[PDB]
Amino acid sequence: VDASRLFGESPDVVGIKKMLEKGKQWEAIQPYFDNVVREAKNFLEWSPNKRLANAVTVAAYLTSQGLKTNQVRKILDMARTTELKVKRGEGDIKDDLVKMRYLLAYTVGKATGQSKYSLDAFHRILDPMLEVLMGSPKKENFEKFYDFLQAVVAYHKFFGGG
Protein backbone atom coordinates (compact mmCIF):
# COMPACT_ATOMS: atom_id res chain seq x y z
CA VAL A 1 0.00 0.00 0.00
CA ASP A 2 2.99 2.27 0.63
CA ALA A 3 3.70 3.96 -2.75
CA SER A 4 2.04 1.06 -4.61
CA ARG A 5 -1.66 1.90 -4.94
CA LEU A 6 -0.93 5.64 -4.81
CA PHE A 7 0.29 6.84 -8.21
CA GLY A 8 0.49 10.05 -10.26
CA GLU A 9 -2.97 11.16 -11.36
CA SER A 10 -6.06 9.29 -10.16
CA PRO A 11 -5.11 5.78 -9.03
CA ASP A 12 -5.84 5.84 -5.30
CA VAL A 13 -8.16 8.78 -4.68
CA VAL A 14 -10.91 6.41 -3.49
CA GLY A 15 -8.90 3.72 -1.68
CA ILE A 16 -6.65 5.92 0.45
CA LYS A 17 -9.57 7.25 2.53
CA LYS A 18 -9.67 4.15 4.75
CA MET A 19 -5.89 4.11 5.26
CA LEU A 20 -5.81 7.72 6.50
CA GLU A 21 -8.59 7.14 9.06
CA LYS A 22 -1.28 4.74 8.13
CA GLY A 23 1.35 6.27 10.41
CA LYS A 24 4.60 4.97 8.90
CA GLN A 25 3.11 4.39 5.43
CA TRP A 26 2.14 8.05 4.92
CA GLU A 27 5.27 9.48 6.56
CA ALA A 28 7.47 8.43 3.61
CA ILE A 29 5.09 8.23 0.63
CA GLN A 30 3.67 11.75 1.05
CA PRO A 31 7.09 13.27 1.81
CA TYR A 32 8.20 13.10 -1.83
CA PHE A 33 5.35 15.26 -3.16
CA ASP A 34 5.86 17.84 -0.39
CA ASN A 35 9.45 18.14 -1.65
CA VAL A 36 8.49 18.11 -5.35
CA VAL A 37 5.96 20.86 -4.61
CA ARG A 38 8.82 22.72 -2.94
CA GLU A 39 10.71 22.10 -6.18
CA ALA A 40 7.53 23.35 -7.88
CA LYS A 41 8.49 26.96 -7.17
CA ASN A 42 6.84 27.96 -10.44
CA PHE A 43 3.10 27.77 -9.70
CA LEU A 44 1.75 27.76 -13.28
CA GLU A 45 4.05 24.93 -14.36
CA TRP A 46 1.07 22.55 -14.49
CA SER A 47 -1.71 23.22 -17.00
CA PRO A 48 -3.03 19.65 -16.72
CA ASN A 49 -4.59 17.96 -13.65
CA LYS A 50 -1.16 17.64 -11.95
CA ARG A 51 -2.19 20.21 -9.32
CA LEU A 52 -5.47 18.44 -8.47
CA ALA A 53 -3.56 15.15 -8.35
CA ASN A 54 -0.91 16.67 -6.06
CA ALA A 55 -3.72 18.26 -4.02
CA VAL A 56 -4.67 14.78 -2.79
CA THR A 57 -1.09 14.03 -1.71
CA VAL A 58 -0.72 17.36 0.12
CA ALA A 59 -4.09 16.92 1.84
CA ALA A 60 -2.93 13.42 2.77
CA TYR A 61 0.24 15.10 4.03
CA LEU A 62 -2.08 17.38 6.05
CA THR A 63 -4.47 14.58 7.11
CA SER A 64 -2.51 13.01 10.00
CA GLN A 65 -1.68 16.52 11.27
CA GLY A 66 -4.04 19.06 12.84
CA LEU A 67 -4.78 21.92 10.37
CA LYS A 68 -7.15 24.01 12.48
CA THR A 69 -9.73 25.88 10.41
CA ASN A 70 -9.79 29.22 12.28
CA GLN A 71 -6.18 29.83 11.20
CA VAL A 72 -6.98 28.61 7.67
CA ARG A 73 -10.01 30.87 6.99
CA LYS A 74 -8.55 34.37 7.50
CA ILE A 75 -5.67 33.62 5.12
CA LEU A 76 -8.16 32.42 2.50
CA ASP A 77 -10.98 34.88 3.16
CA MET A 78 -8.35 37.47 2.30
CA ALA A 79 -7.60 35.56 -0.90
CA ARG A 80 -11.20 36.09 -2.04
CA THR A 81 -11.16 39.84 -1.38
CA THR A 82 -8.18 40.08 -3.69
CA GLU A 83 -10.30 38.20 -6.26
CA LEU A 84 -13.35 40.38 -5.56
CA LYS A 85 -11.23 43.41 -6.51
CA VAL A 86 -10.20 41.70 -9.77
CA LYS A 87 -13.79 42.14 -11.05
CA ARG A 88 -13.20 45.59 -12.64
CA GLY A 89 -12.16 47.01 -9.25
CA GLU A 90 -8.36 47.11 -9.13
CA GLY A 91 -5.32 46.01 -11.10
CA ASP A 92 -2.55 46.30 -8.49
CA ILE A 93 -2.89 44.15 -5.36
CA LYS A 94 0.82 44.53 -4.60
CA ASP A 95 0.23 46.17 -1.21
CA ASP A 96 -1.91 43.24 0.02
CA LEU A 97 0.44 40.40 -0.96
CA VAL A 98 2.96 41.62 1.62
CA LYS A 99 0.15 41.40 4.19
CA MET A 100 -0.83 38.02 2.73
CA ARG A 101 2.61 36.54 3.44
CA TYR A 102 2.58 38.20 6.87
CA LEU A 103 -0.58 36.37 7.97
CA LEU A 104 1.06 33.01 7.26
CA ALA A 105 4.15 34.14 9.18
CA TYR A 106 1.85 35.23 12.02
CA THR A 107 0.08 31.85 11.88
CA VAL A 108 3.16 29.64 12.28
CA GLY A 109 4.39 31.88 15.12
CA LYS A 110 1.15 31.63 17.12
CA ALA A 111 0.26 27.91 16.99
CA THR A 112 2.72 26.46 19.51
CA GLY A 113 2.70 23.06 21.17
CA GLN A 114 1.65 19.83 19.45
CA SER A 115 0.86 21.71 16.20
CA LYS A 116 4.44 22.30 15.03
CA TYR A 117 4.81 19.86 12.11
CA SER A 118 1.19 20.56 11.20
CA LEU A 119 1.69 24.27 10.47
CA ASP A 120 5.17 23.57 9.10
CA ALA A 121 3.57 21.22 6.60
CA PHE A 122 1.45 24.28 5.83
CA HIS A 123 4.56 26.52 5.80
CA ARG A 124 6.47 24.17 3.48
CA ILE A 125 4.40 23.86 0.32
CA LEU A 126 2.78 27.28 -0.18
CA ASP A 127 5.84 29.53 0.19
CA PRO A 128 7.24 28.33 -3.19
CA MET A 129 3.97 29.67 -4.62
CA LEU A 130 3.55 32.64 -2.26
CA GLU A 131 6.58 34.33 -3.79
CA VAL A 132 5.14 34.07 -7.30
CA LEU A 133 2.27 36.56 -7.01
CA MET A 134 4.54 39.59 -6.54
CA GLY A 135 6.11 39.76 -10.00
CA SER A 136 3.12 38.43 -11.94
CA PRO A 137 -0.32 39.65 -13.12
CA LYS A 138 -3.70 38.46 -11.84
CA LYS A 139 -5.63 37.68 -15.06
CA GLU A 140 -3.17 34.82 -15.42
CA ASN A 141 -0.81 33.15 -12.96
CA PHE A 142 -2.90 33.84 -9.85
CA GLU A 143 -6.19 32.18 -10.78
CA LYS A 144 -4.46 28.82 -11.20
CA PHE A 145 -3.52 29.01 -7.54
CA TYR A 146 -7.11 30.05 -6.75
CA ASP A 147 -8.19 26.66 -8.07
CA PHE A 148 -5.45 24.92 -6.06
CA LEU A 149 -6.41 27.16 -3.13
CA GLN A 150 -9.50 25.07 -2.32
CA ALA A 151 -8.24 21.85 -3.94
CA VAL A 152 -6.25 20.88 -0.85
CA VAL A 153 -8.97 22.14 1.52
CA ALA A 154 -11.63 19.77 0.20
CA TYR A 155 -9.86 16.39 0.14
CA HIS A 156 -8.56 17.16 3.64
CA LYS A 157 -12.19 16.90 4.75
CA PHE A 158 -12.52 13.75 2.63
CA PHE A 159 -9.69 11.90 4.38
CA GLY A 160 -11.18 12.77 7.78
CA GLY A 161 -10.09 16.27 8.78
CA GLY A 162 -11.73 19.47 9.95
Binding site: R73, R80, L84, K87
Partner: protein
Protein backbone atom coordinates in the same frame (compact mmCIF):
# COMPACT_ATOMS: atom_id res chain seq x y z
CA UNK B 1 -63.91 44.98 -9.67
CA UNK B 2 -62.60 48.57 -9.86
CA UNK B 3 -58.83 48.92 -9.41
CA UNK B 4 -57.78 52.55 -9.78
CA UNK B 5 -54.60 54.61 -9.45
CA UNK B 6 -53.80 58.02 -7.98
CA UNK B 7 -50.10 58.06 -7.15
CA UNK B 8 -47.32 56.36 -5.23
CA UNK B 9 -46.29 57.56 -1.77
CA UNK B 10 -42.57 56.79 -1.71
CA UNK B 11 -40.82 56.41 1.62
CA UNK B 12 -37.05 56.49 1.38
CA UNK B 13 -34.59 56.43 4.23
CA UNK B 14 -31.67 54.59 5.75
CA UNK B 15 -31.65 51.55 8.05
CA UNK B 16 -29.16 51.73 10.93
CA UNK B 17 -27.90 48.36 12.17
CA UNK B 18 -27.28 49.50 15.73
CA UNK B 19 -26.30 46.03 16.82
CA UNK B 20 -24.75 43.41 14.56
CA UNK B 21 -27.07 42.21 11.86
CA UNK B 22 -27.47 38.63 10.74
CA UNK B 23 -29.82 37.49 7.98
CA UNK B 24 -28.50 34.11 6.99
CA UNK B 25 -28.71 31.73 4.05
CA UNK B 26 -27.18 28.52 2.76
CA UNK B 27 -19.62 29.07 7.91
CA UNK B 28 -23.16 30.36 8.36
CA UNK B 29 -23.05 33.22 5.87
CA UNK B 30 -25.30 36.21 5.70
CA UNK B 31 -26.70 36.69 2.20
CA UNK B 32 -24.63 38.99 0.07
CA UNK B 33 -25.03 40.38 -3.40
CA UNK B 34 -23.49 37.81 -5.75
CA UNK B 35 -22.00 40.61 -7.81
CA UNK B 36 -20.42 42.91 -5.24
CA UNK B 37 -20.12 40.41 -2.39
CA UNK B 38 -21.82 42.70 0.11
CA UNK B 39 -24.71 42.06 2.52
CA UNK B 40 -28.24 43.43 2.26
CA UNK B 41 -31.62 43.30 3.91
CA UNK B 42 -34.04 41.62 1.49
CA UNK B 43 -37.37 43.14 0.86
CA UNK B 44 -38.82 39.69 1.26
CA UNK B 45 -37.32 39.55 4.74
CA UNK B 46 -38.36 43.06 5.66
CA UNK B 47 -41.93 42.85 4.37
CA UNK B 48 -42.39 39.67 6.34
CA UNK B 49 -41.19 40.98 9.69
CA UNK B 50 -43.30 44.07 9.02
CA UNK B 51 -46.22 41.72 8.50
CA UNK B 52 -45.31 39.29 11.28
CA UNK B 53 -45.57 42.10 13.83
CA UNK B 54 -48.66 43.75 12.41
CA UNK B 55 -50.78 40.63 12.22
CA UNK B 56 -50.04 39.91 15.89
CA UNK B 57 -51.06 43.51 16.58
CA UNK B 58 -54.29 42.90 14.70
CA UNK B 59 -54.60 39.44 16.31
CA UNK B 60 -55.14 41.03 19.71
CA UNK B 61 -57.64 43.65 18.53
CA UNK B 62 -60.15 41.75 16.37
CA UNK B 63 -63.10 42.83 18.49
CA UNK B 64 -62.91 46.60 18.50
CA UNK B 65 -62.06 47.22 14.82
CA UNK B 66 -64.86 45.42 12.98
CA UNK B 67 -66.78 48.71 12.79
CA UNK B 68 -63.82 50.60 11.25
CA UNK B 69 -62.62 47.74 9.07
CA UNK B 70 -65.50 45.37 8.35
CA UNK B 71 -65.11 41.72 7.28
CA UNK B 72 -63.56 41.15 10.70
CA UNK B 73 -66.89 39.55 11.52
CA UNK B 74 -65.31 36.47 9.96
CA UNK B 75 -62.53 36.22 12.49
CA UNK B 76 -62.23 35.28 16.15
CA UNK B 77 -58.72 35.48 17.63
CA UNK B 78 -56.86 32.21 17.34
CA UNK B 79 -55.19 29.94 14.77
CA UNK B 80 -55.90 26.72 12.90
CA UNK B 81 -53.20 24.46 14.28
CA UNK B 82 -55.92 22.96 16.61
CA UNK B 83 -58.07 21.81 13.68
CA UNK B 84 -57.15 21.43 10.01
CA UNK B 85 -59.49 23.79 8.25
CA UNK B 86 -58.16 26.32 5.77
CA UNK B 87 -60.95 28.69 6.72
CA UNK B 88 -62.85 28.79 9.98
CA UNK B 89 -63.58 31.65 12.37
CA UNK B 90 -59.89 31.99 13.22
CA UNK B 91 -57.56 34.74 12.10
CA UNK B 92 -54.64 32.58 10.97
CA UNK B 93 -56.52 30.96 8.11
CA UNK B 94 -53.81 30.06 5.58
CA UNK B 95 -52.13 26.62 5.61
CA UNK B 96 -48.84 28.01 4.07
CA UNK B 97 -47.18 24.55 4.42
CA UNK B 98 -46.62 23.68 8.14
CA UNK B 99 -46.97 27.26 9.56
CA UNK B 100 -50.25 29.29 9.43
CA UNK B 101 -50.56 32.95 8.20
CA UNK B 102 -53.50 35.35 7.80
CA UNK B 103 -54.65 35.62 4.17
CA UNK B 104 -58.22 36.61 3.33
CA UNK B 105 -59.62 34.28 0.64
CA UNK B 106 -61.01 36.76 -1.87
CA UNK B 107 -60.80 40.25 -3.30
CA UNK B 108 -63.68 41.82 -1.43
CA UNK B 109 -63.11 40.28 1.95
CA UNK B 110 -59.53 41.58 1.78
CA UNK B 111 -60.68 44.97 0.56
CA UNK B 112 -61.90 45.62 4.11
CA UNK B 113 -59.26 43.65 6.00
CA UNK B 114 -56.72 46.21 7.24
CA UNK B 115 -53.89 43.72 6.82
CA UNK B 116 -54.53 42.16 3.44
CA UNK B 117 -55.27 45.45 1.74
CA UNK B 118 -51.85 46.70 2.72
CA UNK B 119 -49.47 43.79 2.43
CA UNK B 120 -51.58 41.90 -0.06
CA UNK B 121 -53.76 38.86 -0.18
CA UNK B 122 -54.01 35.68 -2.27
CA UNK B 123 -57.05 33.49 -3.08
CA UNK B 124 -58.68 30.77 -5.18
CA UNK B 125 -60.59 32.43 -8.11
CA UNK B 126 -60.45 36.20 -7.24
CA UNK B 127 -57.29 37.42 -5.36
CA UNK B 128 -56.05 40.86 -4.11
CA UNK B 129 -52.65 42.44 -5.13
CA UNK B 130 -50.32 44.16 -2.59
CA UNK B 131 -50.14 47.95 -2.21
CA UNK B 132 -46.72 48.40 -0.64
CA UNK B 133 -43.64 47.21 -2.44
CA UNK B 134 -40.40 46.86 -0.50
CA UNK B 135 -37.16 46.91 -2.43
CA UNK B 136 -34.13 44.97 -1.29
CA UNK B 137 -32.03 47.38 0.76
CA UNK B 138 -28.29 47.52 0.09
CA UNK B 139 -25.36 49.20 1.85
CA UNK B 140 -25.13 52.95 1.55
CA UNK B 141 -22.44 54.83 -0.38
CA UNK B 142 -20.19 55.63 2.57
CA UNK B 143 -20.00 51.99 3.64
CA UNK B 144 -18.93 51.01 0.16
CA UNK B 145 -15.90 53.22 0.79
CA UNK B 146 -15.19 51.49 4.10
CA UNK B 147 -15.19 48.22 2.16
CA UNK B 148 -12.90 49.79 -0.45
CA UNK B 149 -10.36 50.77 2.21
CA UNK B 150 -10.22 47.70 4.47
CA UNK B 151 -12.66 48.61 7.23
CA UNK B 152 -14.57 45.54 8.38
CA UNK B 153 -18.09 45.11 7.10
CA UNK B 154 -18.48 41.57 8.50
CA UNK B 155 -17.14 39.68 11.50
CA UNK B 156 -17.13 36.08 12.66
CA UNK B 157 -18.57 35.71 16.15
CA UNK B 158 -17.70 32.45 17.89
CA UNK B 159 -20.76 31.43 19.84
CA UNK B 160 -18.58 26.15 19.61
CA UNK B 161 -19.81 27.68 16.35
CA UNK B 162 -19.71 30.94 14.41
CA UNK B 163 -22.71 33.13 13.60
CA UNK B 164 -21.45 35.69 11.13
CA UNK B 165 -23.00 39.13 11.53
CA UNK B 166 -22.85 42.45 9.71
CA UNK B 167 -20.74 44.56 12.03
CA UNK B 168 -22.64 47.04 14.14
CA UNK B 169 -23.02 50.64 13.11
CA UNK B 170 -23.40 49.60 9.46
CA UNK B 171 -26.15 51.33 7.44
CA UNK B 172 -28.38 50.11 4.54
CA UNK B 173 -30.61 51.96 2.02
CA UNK B 174 -34.31 50.93 2.16
CA UNK B 175 -37.03 52.18 -0.25
CA UNK B 176 -40.76 51.52 0.49
CA UNK B 177 -43.41 52.38 -2.17
CA UNK B 178 -47.14 52.61 -1.30
CA UNK B 179 -49.68 52.55 -4.18
CA UNK B 180 -52.61 54.99 -3.68
CA UNK B 181 -55.45 52.98 -5.18
CA UNK B 182 -58.34 54.61 -3.35
CA UNK B 183 -58.33 58.13 -1.97
CA UNK B 184 -60.75 57.44 0.88
CA UNK B 185 -58.43 55.02 2.65
CA UNK B 186 -54.83 56.07 2.20
CA UNK B 187 -54.43 57.70 5.63
CA UNK B 188 -55.04 54.45 7.44
CA UNK B 189 -52.72 52.53 5.16
CA UNK B 190 -49.91 54.99 5.82
CA UNK B 191 -50.73 54.95 9.53
CA UNK B 192 -50.97 51.17 9.63
CA UNK B 193 -47.62 50.94 7.83
CA UNK B 194 -45.72 53.16 10.23
CA UNK B 195 -47.46 51.30 13.07
CA UNK B 196 -45.74 48.18 11.74
CA UNK B 197 -42.40 50.02 11.72
CA UNK B 198 -42.71 51.23 15.29
CA UNK B 199 -43.05 47.59 16.27
CA UNK B 200 -39.87 46.70 14.38
CA UNK B 201 -37.78 49.20 16.33
CA UNK B 202 -38.75 47.30 19.51
CA UNK B 203 -38.48 43.84 17.97
CA UNK B 204 -35.49 42.68 15.92
CA UNK B 205 -34.61 41.82 12.33
CA UNK B 206 -33.20 38.54 11.13
CA UNK B 207 -31.18 35.90 12.87
CA UNK B 208 -31.37 35.02 16.52
CA UNK B 209 -32.23 38.49 17.78
CA UNK B 210 -33.22 37.31 21.26
CA UNK B 211 -29.44 37.14 21.68
CA UNK B 212 -29.23 40.75 20.51
CA UNK B 213 -28.68 40.53 16.79
CA UNK B 214 -31.37 43.10 16.01
CA UNK B 215 -31.97 46.69 17.14
CA UNK B 216 -32.69 47.99 13.71
CA UNK B 217 -33.48 51.70 13.60
CA UNK B 218 -34.90 53.77 10.75
CA UNK B 219 -33.50 57.16 9.73
CA UNK B 220 -35.89 58.95 7.40
CA UNK B 221 -34.81 61.06 4.46
CA UNK B 222 -37.84 61.89 2.34
CA UNK B 223 -41.50 61.24 1.94
CA UNK B 224 -42.66 61.86 -1.59
CA UNK B 225 -46.20 61.70 -2.87
CA UNK B 226 -45.78 61.54 -6.72
CA UNK B 227 -49.31 62.18 -8.07
CA UNK B 228 -50.65 60.80 -11.36
CA UNK B 229 -49.76 64.20 -12.93
CA UNK B 230 -46.05 63.47 -12.22
CA UNK B 231 -46.09 60.33 -14.43
CA UNK B 232 -47.70 62.20 -17.41
CA UNK B 233 -45.21 65.15 -17.09
CA UNK B 234 -41.50 64.59 -16.22
CA UNK B 235 -41.25 67.90 -14.24
CA UNK B 236 -40.40 67.40 -10.51
CA UNK B 237 -43.76 68.77 -9.33
CA UNK B 238 -44.41 66.25 -6.55
CA UNK B 239 -44.88 66.74 -2.81
CA UNK B 240 -41.75 66.40 -0.67
CA UNK B 241 -42.67 65.97 2.98
CA UNK B 242 -39.21 66.24 4.58
CA UNK B 243 -38.86 64.55 7.96
CA UNK B 244 -35.09 64.31 7.87
CA UNK B 245 -34.42 64.54 11.62
CA UNK B 246 -37.65 62.84 12.66
CA UNK B 247 -38.13 59.37 14.07
CA UNK B 248 -40.82 56.83 13.15
CA UNK B 249 -42.15 57.28 16.70
CA UNK B 250 -42.63 60.97 15.88
CA UNK B 251 -44.04 60.88 12.35
CA UNK B 252 -46.89 58.58 13.28
CA UNK B 253 -47.19 60.52 16.52
CA UNK B 254 -49.14 63.79 16.68
CA UNK B 255 -47.20 65.54 14.04
CA UNK B 256 -48.69 63.22 11.43
CA UNK B 257 -51.42 65.29 9.79
CA UNK B 258 -49.18 68.33 10.04
CA UNK B 259 -46.78 66.42 7.80
CA UNK B 260 -49.58 65.11 5.56
CA UNK B 261 -51.49 68.28 4.83
CA UNK B 262 -50.02 68.61 1.32
CA UNK B 263 -51.15 65.17 0.20
CA UNK B 264 -54.64 66.57 0.80
CA UNK B 265 -53.84 69.42 -1.60
CA UNK B 266 -53.78 66.95 -4.47
CA UNK B 267 -56.31 64.48 -2.98
Amino acid sequence: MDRRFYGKIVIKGKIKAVTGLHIGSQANPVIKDPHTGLPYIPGSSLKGRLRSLFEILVNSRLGEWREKYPSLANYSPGSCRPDNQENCGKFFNRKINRGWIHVCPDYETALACPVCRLFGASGKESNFPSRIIVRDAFLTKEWEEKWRAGEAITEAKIEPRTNERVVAGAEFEFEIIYNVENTTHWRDDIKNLLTAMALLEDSYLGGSGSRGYGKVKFIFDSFEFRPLDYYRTGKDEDIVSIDAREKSVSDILSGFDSLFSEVEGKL
